[PDB]
Design an enzyme around this catalytic site. Sequence first.
Site, PDB file in Angstrom:
ATOM      1  N   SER A  20       0.783  -1.202   0.000  1.00 14.65           N
ATOM      2  CA  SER A  20       0.000   0.000   0.000  1.00 14.65           C
ATOM      3  C   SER A  20       0.839   1.289   0.000  1.00 14.65           C
ATOM      4  O   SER A  20       1.929   1.346   0.579  1.00 14.65           O
ATOM      5  CB  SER A  20      -0.801  -0.088   1.302  1.00 14.65           C
ATOM      6  OG  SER A  20      -1.395   1.153   1.644  1.00 14.65           O
ATOM      7  N   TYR A  60      -1.537  -0.012  10.545  1.00 15.93           N
ATOM      8  CA  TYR A  60      -1.801  -0.726   9.317  1.00 15.93           C
ATOM      9  C   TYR A  60      -0.590  -0.595   8.397  1.00 15.93           C
ATOM     10  O   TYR A  60      -0.040  -1.589   7.861  1.00 15.93           O
ATOM     11  CB  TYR A  60      -3.129  -0.222   8.728  1.00 15.93           C
ATOM     12  CG  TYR A  60      -3.258  -0.571   7.270  1.00 15.93           C
ATOM     13  CD1 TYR A  60      -3.158   0.402   6.267  1.00 15.93           C
ATOM     14  CD2 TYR A  60      -3.453  -1.905   6.900  1.00 15.93           C
ATOM     15  CE1 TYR A  60      -3.307   0.098   4.911  1.00 15.93           C
ATOM     16  CE2 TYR A  60      -3.604  -2.230   5.544  1.00 15.93           C
ATOM     17  CZ  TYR A  60      -3.528  -1.240   4.558  1.00 15.93           C
ATOM     18  OH  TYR A  60      -3.691  -1.586   3.240  1.00 15.93           O
ATOM     19  N   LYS A  98       2.183  -3.407   6.717  1.00 10.17           N
ATOM     20  CA  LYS A  98       2.573  -3.588   5.322  1.00 10.17           C
ATOM     21  C   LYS A  98       4.078  -3.436   5.172  1.00 10.17           C
ATOM     22  O   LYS A  98       4.734  -4.201   4.459  1.00 10.17           O
ATOM     23  CB  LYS A  98       1.857  -2.565   4.478  1.00 10.17           C
ATOM     24  CG  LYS A  98       0.347  -2.839   4.365  1.00 10.17           C
ATOM     25  CD  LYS A  98       0.050  -4.118   3.582  1.00 10.17           C
ATOM     26  CE  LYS A  98      -1.426  -4.354   3.391  1.00 10.17           C
ATOM     27  NZ  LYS A  98      -1.650  -5.698   2.817  1.00 10.17           N
TER      28      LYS A  98
END
Lengths: 674, 674
Positions: free
Chosen positions: A125, A153, A157
């Site tokens: 991402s 989050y 990643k």
Amino acid sequence: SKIVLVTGGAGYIGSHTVVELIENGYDCVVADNLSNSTYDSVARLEVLTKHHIPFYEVDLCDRKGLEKVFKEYKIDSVIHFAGLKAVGESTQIPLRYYHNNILGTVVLLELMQQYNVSKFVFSSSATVYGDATRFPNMIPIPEECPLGPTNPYGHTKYAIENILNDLYNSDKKSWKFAILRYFNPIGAHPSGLIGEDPLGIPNNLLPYMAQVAVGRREKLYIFRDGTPIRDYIHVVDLAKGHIAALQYLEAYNENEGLCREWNLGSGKGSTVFEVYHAFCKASGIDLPYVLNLTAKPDRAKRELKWQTELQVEDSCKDLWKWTTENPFGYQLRGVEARFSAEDMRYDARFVTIGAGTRFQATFANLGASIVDLKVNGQSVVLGYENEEGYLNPDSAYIGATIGRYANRISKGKFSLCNKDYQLTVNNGVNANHSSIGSFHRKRFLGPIIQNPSKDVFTAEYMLIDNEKDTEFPGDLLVTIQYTVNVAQKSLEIVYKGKLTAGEATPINLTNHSYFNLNKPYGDTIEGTEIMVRSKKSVDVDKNMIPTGNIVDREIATFNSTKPTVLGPKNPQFDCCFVVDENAKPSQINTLNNELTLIVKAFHPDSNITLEVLSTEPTYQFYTGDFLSAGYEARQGFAIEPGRYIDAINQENWKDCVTLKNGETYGSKIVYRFS
Amino acid sequence: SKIVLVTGGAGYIGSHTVVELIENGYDCVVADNLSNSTYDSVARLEVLTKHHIPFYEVDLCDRKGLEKVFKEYKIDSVIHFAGLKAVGESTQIPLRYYHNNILGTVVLLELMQQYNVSKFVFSSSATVYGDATRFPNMIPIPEECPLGPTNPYGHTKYAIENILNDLYNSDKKSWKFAILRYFNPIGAHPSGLIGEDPLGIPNNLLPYMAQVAVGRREKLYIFRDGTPIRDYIHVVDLAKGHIAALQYLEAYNENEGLCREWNLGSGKGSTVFEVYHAFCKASGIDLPYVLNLTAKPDRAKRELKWQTELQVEDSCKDLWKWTTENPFGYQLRGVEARFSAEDMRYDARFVTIGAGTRFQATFANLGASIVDLKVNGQSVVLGYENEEGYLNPDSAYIGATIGRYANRISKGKFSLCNKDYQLTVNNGVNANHSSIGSFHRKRFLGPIIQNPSKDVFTAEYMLIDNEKDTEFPGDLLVTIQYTVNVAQKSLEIVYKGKLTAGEATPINLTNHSYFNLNKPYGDTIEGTEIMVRSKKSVDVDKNMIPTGNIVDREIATFNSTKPTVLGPKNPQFDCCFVVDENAKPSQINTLNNELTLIVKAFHPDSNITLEVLSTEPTYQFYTGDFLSAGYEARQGFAIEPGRYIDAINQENWKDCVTLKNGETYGSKIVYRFS
Ligand SMILES: NC(=O)c1ccc[n+]([C@@H]2O[C@H](COP(=O)([O-])OP(=O)(O)OC[C@H]3O[C@@H](n4cnc5c(N)ncnc54)[C@H](O)[C@@H]3O)[C@@H](O)[C@H]2O)c1
Ligand SMILES: NC(=O)c1ccc[n+]([C@@H]2O[C@H](COP(=O)([O-])OP(=O)(O)OC[C@H]3O[C@@H](n4cnc5c(N)ncnc54)[C@H](O)[C@@H]3O)[C@@H](O)[C@H]2O)c1
Ligand SMILES: O=c1ccn([C@@H]2O[C@H](COP(=O)(O)OP(=O)(O)O[C@H]3O[C@H](CO)[C@@H](O)[C@H](O)[C@H]3O)[C@@H](O)[C@H]2O)c(=O)[nH]1
Ligand SMILES: O=c1ccn([C@@H]2O[C@H](COP(=O)(O)OP(=O)(O)O[C@H]3O[C@H](CO)[C@@H](O)[C@H](O)[C@H]3O)[C@@H](O)[C@H]2O)c(=O)[nH]1
Ligand SMILES: OC[C@H]1O[C@@H](O)[C@H](O)[C@@H](O)[C@H]1O
Ligand SMILES: OC[C@H]1O[C@@H](O)[C@H](O)[C@@H](O)[C@H]1O
Ligand code: NA
Ligand code: NA
Ligand code: NA
Ligand code: NA
């Protein structure tokens, strides 16, 4: 065919990518724990892509569970979309994010290592970059922008990206990894069949706008002009970017490895408002109402030879279609499903539409069978609790789709295109109901379930029947569309068939439901009143094969003063009634023909009336005198609209059951209760 | 007392920190899967710190297993040292590093969250910084240097640091985290009892040098002057830094939280060679033979009020002591251990020293018992396969340490310091073998096992016997040192006792081994030949209590022409023999007295001879006529050197069994076989 393991494949991006994969010749297996999706997307994909998609409801963190996939199929590559992705929520339940996201990946990778699977495409991402403005000239964001996520989050990643790089570095020749940094994916497949179905409350600009335009949200809140920036990429362009990544990995030697990353974005920055407007423009409605995050897409363009081809406008229209066609997403009130085989076997389900209403229809993937029909809460057809009963070797074909050829074929033989065929004989000296190739035991794709309008529900199934797997000639594609109208208490069945390869095939499908209009009270069909359109029927010989003649049966017609009453033992019928004794059957597709009322059945004790109508030339009527496999004689009666008996061998009837390349077989049946 | 959960506590740094914790008033529980350590460090710590240390052999990744700790104890804080830390190896097996390190931490944190434990001290590493020279003026390294690990191991620490920060940020008031970035810890506890025991091949400069100086490695390879730089911190200074961190967390409100990091280093950069030299200097030997990584220690000094106090020289000397005392680390050839209770219950073990030799001694934590003695492969004492047998309520006190007071005490009463005590009566009208407070059922600390010289093995146990838990007055500390000389086939037992609180206590320990010199052949001690130093014995009344008189027993002495032969039934003895009938027993500690030969026992059928010697004034001789609990009468004979019978109540004998504050009780027993 290369088999791609698609983790998180029932989700948004993953589902769209499956379309692209199947279209590009890959076979897919999906593994998803359904934490933020339902199996419905997968079922729809089967139909949309015309391919079966094996599905495993599994948490990637469950090694034992995930290992089964690797044991069951030879995986060539993995595209890993599985994960938790709500930035906001990540800040609140960080431990779950790290545990789920990191542990899932590690387990998957350890199994791949173990199973020697080297190709991996990872859903990264743009969040890994953090605020790029912390650097000068970093917008649009290059792959080389230093990573520095600012939320849990992103952290997950970023961790995963390092695990990958570290892993490749540890055994450079055994791993081929493509790390894809997605920007802001939006949109839906143009068919409007699949899209994003946020299980809860849209965190996203888009899905949230859509929920508003559909009254699911009262209003939407807008949080260079004023608005935070992003690079909105059409989910289809994104999906295609995965195919590009896979081919890039595929270009590498078996003996070589690599680890590289690519931003997948349009390179176009979008002003929230700008979006809003695009959306309002698209939906024709006025909703209420990091700095930047635009991708530099040069590397992907140059190396993967990929770039976006769609516009925000297209994303908006496509999302709007999916939205209007499915305002509430895949889950529908009035639709329920249950397992019909082993727990968690998703392609073995019994789906009920019109659930909780005065007209409930249950269908199975197996034989695209009509499992049950309940009128005013009362079941009116025979069936079994599970697939086991349907699978009995001593089948009575209860509730099944009959195919490719219903009823008898003389001695099992026929010729076509000046070629002689022999089918397995299973009934006396003939092949009845296509014997070994019977659709009743075949597992159909889907279904696609919709609730297009008040009181209306639809279920569509598909069957891929390849020549290589049957005694018949040609690769046939079949579709079955069931339409349940609760207000009218009617079930409409539409069959379509088309050869995808081959010059021609005999074809004659039907539904073999067995009715019983007095189940609450009563051990047989005794008491049922019957009237048919006409007594005219296909005369047959001692082997149930046509003599060529047309005779009258002793049975009431609609103009008779009294109906034919079926007793506990007699009368007994097993014949083919002709709609128009005159007719010269020429059509392979009767869908545009008149929907003729052919049978009226009534039970005075339940007060239920059943009417069967069909666009077909004939109809078989059978009193279930030879009912087996769990039932006894006369426990239900069948009405099977179709095309004569042995038509394929009958001069005057053969053309109407001969599907040639380029044409489309079509047939319709309707059951209406009152 | 606050209970600290120390993960990875059997390892290097963790073990040293446990010392500091216990010394600072904390109670510790250790959880370690022993992937890079053995339980031996923990056993040694018990003795060194004089505290029991509950131990759980568990993988932090095993939630169920780890949860037991939280269920079993009220954890106040956690210091997490557990993890894989070989940078080199991390590059090779990255998946294991991430899985082990990250998953272990997350599980632990999830349980803490669940159990509401908020205080956490984390073992971070200077590896998180990567190459600081990538920035200008970044050496010495400040906490603020941007993180950028360059190896998988660093990656895992970096991930963990983010999980912590993220977690705190998610619930700022429920977490108090101290992240400690260690530099290069070296050294050993100055006692030389614990140190680093690299299970495999030193990856580290230090342990590797040490293995060389001890011939465990042929040569060591040296990989501003030429040499890569580091900040070598004495493991003791490091450990103390943890206590500083804990207090800092402790200063915060119950209702407040925090997340902060501190480098723990000396601030002094060391030239590999510089080390070498320090080492060679320390060891008095010439071994064969990122740029920089020096900590800026200002923040810790100012905030934690901590700084290193030791030098590289001290680290070198201390490591050298641990090395010379334990050249092969904790594992020793000739030493074996097994569980004596439930699987994995480490404080319930049977340890054999002299294993595989002509003289094997097995001891248990329970009662510091002598489980077995094998001479030339033949067991010569009675015992049980497990603790269960020792724990029988109908104890014969087989092989046990008897304490605090051996034999009988009249009516269970005594007075001391002008205070009257009453002990639970358990034998006739008296208290025998201290009845309820008997050491035979108490679990001792340790052991510390050494192989100080060829053929010599030692086992040391300790017992903390608090007044609050016994009928006796005072807090007594007891130590038992067993010395096994394989060449001489001898067992030496040295008792020491000291009051840590209280004015005085009666004390009179012994070992209650039961011998049988003819086990291979023979259901009783029948055939044993006995001679004792003298027939002089403590005359007793019908209640086994001294009359005040001294009489002769009918038994052979060393000058008798024939020995006393024990038959299947007679003669029967149960008496206290006096070493010197003249003696006026005045000493609480006989350790410097002559080691007097008191009993000679011989079995002509096995040809084994046993000699017992002791520095004690008397010795009880008992023919096991009343042997119970699994054995029958006369199946073994006991010889218990000690201090009379009821000495505490006997005018002339009381002082020698009265341990006063400030003094040390001492007693020695020797068994020699030939
Ligand atoms: N939508 C975005 O804006 C965005 C942006 C970039 C990166 N991504 C990433 O792309 C991937 C797909 O995103 P999406 O929008 O389709 O999300 P999604 O929620 O629709 O799809 C992810 C799927 O993973 C499944 N899943 C979650 N944890 C799992 C586990 N432990 N085992 C098995 N299945 C599990 C979920 O049930 C879901 O079906 C994710 O990794 C996401 O982080 C998405
Ligand atoms: N020694 C160094 O130079 C150094 C430098 C800085 C940071 N550190 C860190 O300090 C900590 C302690 O290091 P050390 O030198 O004492 O190492 P160590 O190997 O002696 O101690 C770590 C302990 O953790 C245990 N362990 C490993 N994985 C576990 C798991 N999953 N569950 C339970 N126990 C487990 C091991 O068995 C071992 O006893 C580690 O986290 C290490 O990364 C050490
Ligand atoms: O309810 C909302 C949500 C967002 N916005 C705004 O409109 C834009 C859209 O935000 P959103 O759709 O959630 O996009 P992002 O916050 O930019 O985050 C996405 O884009 C990341 C990369 O940019 C992905 O990698 C992540 O998985 C994904 O959450 C932003 O300007 C928001 O400020 C609103 O006005 N209302
Ligand atoms: O066998 C060896 C190993 C090392 N060295 C050299 O001597 C020094 C010591 O290296 P080593 O003891 O392994 O220290 P580091 O490589 O610096 O790594 C440690 O120090 C890190 C922070 O610096 C910790 O956080 C890590 O856990 C730990 O591995 C370095 O100059 C090495 O080049 C040798 O000459 N021979
Ligand atoms: O049980 C299946 C039944 O199906 C009817 O179509 C057929 O005419 C009957 O003869 C019997 O085969
Ligand atoms: O079984 C334990 C035995 O121990 C001896 O010390 C004692 O004198 C015996 O009378 C008996 O108590
Ligand atoms: Na719909
Ligand atoms: Na539903
Ligand atoms: Na030693
Ligand atoms: Na050993």
